[PDB]
Design a protein around this ligand. Structure first.
Ligand SMILES: CCCCCCCCCCCC(=O)O
Length: 121
């Protein structure tokens, strides 16, 4: 669920997920995908594409089990779909942390309506 996603992003990036990524670029947070503005935004593009494959569960509302042990995310979910959801989330948290070097506050509250049509997943 969004609960787990936000906890993973805070643990890896050190940033509040809604404030920093809830409206970042053309792909992070609310809305749909678009042409990424930078690397942080490409992370969220990949994340949303990763979510489209989850037909047997709900990425928004269904919670799953995971641990923050030794500064690393471990998915401890046995439900197959919720397991894929956890790995989708884990991937974006790690990806965003890796691109903290090029994170720019200008994209923080992006006007997502002017975003260009996204490429296919
Ligand atoms: C625990 C706090 C709840 C935050 C959950 C939403 C996460 C922020 C949205 C941006 C993540 C992304 O799209 O890559």
């Amino acid at each position: 669920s969004l609960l787990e996603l936000g906890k993973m992003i805070l643990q890896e990036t050190g940033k509040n997920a809604i404030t920093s990524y809830g409206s970042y670029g053309c792909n992070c947070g609310w809305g749909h995908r678009g042409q990424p503005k930078d690397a942080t935004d490409r992370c969220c593009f990949v994340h949303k594409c990763c979510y489209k494959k989850l037909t047997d569960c709900n990425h928004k509302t269904d919670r799953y089990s995971y641990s923050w042990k030794n500064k690393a995310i471990i998915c401890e979910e046995k439900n197959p779909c919720l397991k894929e959801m956890c790995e989708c989330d884990k991937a974006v948290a790690i990806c965003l942390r890796e691109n903290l070097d090029t994170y720019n506050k200008k994209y923080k509250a992006y006007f997502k309506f002017k975003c260009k049509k996204p490429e296919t997943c």
